[PDB]
Design a protein around this ligand. Structure first.
Ligand code: NA
Ligand code: NA
Length: 286
């Protein structure tokens, strides 16, 4: 197209994952580290005038209750504050080339994970921590590392509470925000499609609540490898397929039991699920 026309930028990742275009833009703050040590700058674009010709803007998406983000308008350097240990956060970055009628803007998410050692010496890390999934086809995330000394055979892991969804490029009618009582949004619609009585419960996302019908869950964690599974043909409605990102709190138990009632130190939000029909899996030759 025109002189301002472009289609992408990239920040990459600090996880050693390559090539960077096969993964979301995503940054981990290591266990026991500081948020102010991870201030990513962009590394790629198809803008002809390049990274130092773009106007950089940021909007914090997750977690609105406690996280903030700012951006250097010239360099694109992002700074995050307030994200809590054991949680992921999400921002939307907008880059704009030019001004006026022929200006072109491109918006993309950037994700963050503040890792930690939680109860019982667990250090739960998905690498990548953004699972890019096609909602028509479904799929399974990476298997996480659990931490040194953890018995994987007695580990149990399940979604629990605090589910949030952020529309990225889906229809505006996929309303963003927390799954909550008396709020009609994309997550309440998804929940209700699983069961009219699901409410704000873990049930649509739970292994332990779907043991005899896993294929019916919106998604679940398996108890062998602890991958997150997303089932096909559910994250959609008449207006369109999900095109957006979901985060939920996940609880664990180190004694072979359903972790429903795990206490506060055995609760984390270690993974973001990003739905987009354009995603095809990169299997690395299996
Ligand atoms: Na559904
Ligand atoms: Na959460």
């Amino acid at each position: 197209a025109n002189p301002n026309y472009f289609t992408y930028f990239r920040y990459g990742n600090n996880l050693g994952l390559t090539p960077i275009e096969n993964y979301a833009d995503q940054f981990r703050i290591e266990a026991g580290g500081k948020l102010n040590s991870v201030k990513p700058v962009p590394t790629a674009t198809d803008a002809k005038d390049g990274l130092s010709s773009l106007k950089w803007e940021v909007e914090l998406k997750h977690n609105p209750n406690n996280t903030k983000a700012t951006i250097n308008e010239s360099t694109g350097q992002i700074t995050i504050t307030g994200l809590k240990q054991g949680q992921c956060g999400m921002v939307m970055v907008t880059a704009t080339a030019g001004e006026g009628k022929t200006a072109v803007s491109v918006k993309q998410p950037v994700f963050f994970h503040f890792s930690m050692i939680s109860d019982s010496n667990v250090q739960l890390e998905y690498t990548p921590f953004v699972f890019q999934v096609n909602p028509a086809r479904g799929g399974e995330s990476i298997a996480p590392s659990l931490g040194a000394g953890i018995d994987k055979s007695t580990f149990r892991l399940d979604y629990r509470r605090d589910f949030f969804y952020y529309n990225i490029a889906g229809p505006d009618s996929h309303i963003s925000g927390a799954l909550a009582q008396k709020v009609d949004n994309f997550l309440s619609e998804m929940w209700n499609s699983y069961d009219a009585t699901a409410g704000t419960s873990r049930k649509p996302m739970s292994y332990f609540e779907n043991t005899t019908n896993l294929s019916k869950a919106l998604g679940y964690i398996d108890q062998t490898d602890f991958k997150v599974h997303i089932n096909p043909n559910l994250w959609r409605n008449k207006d369109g397929y999900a095109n957006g990102a979901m985060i939920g709190q996940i609880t664990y138990d180190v004694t072979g039991k359903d972790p429903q009632a795990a206490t506060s130190g055995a609760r984390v939000s270690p993974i973001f699920i990003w739905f987009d029909t354009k995603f095809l899996e990169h299997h690395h030759h299996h």
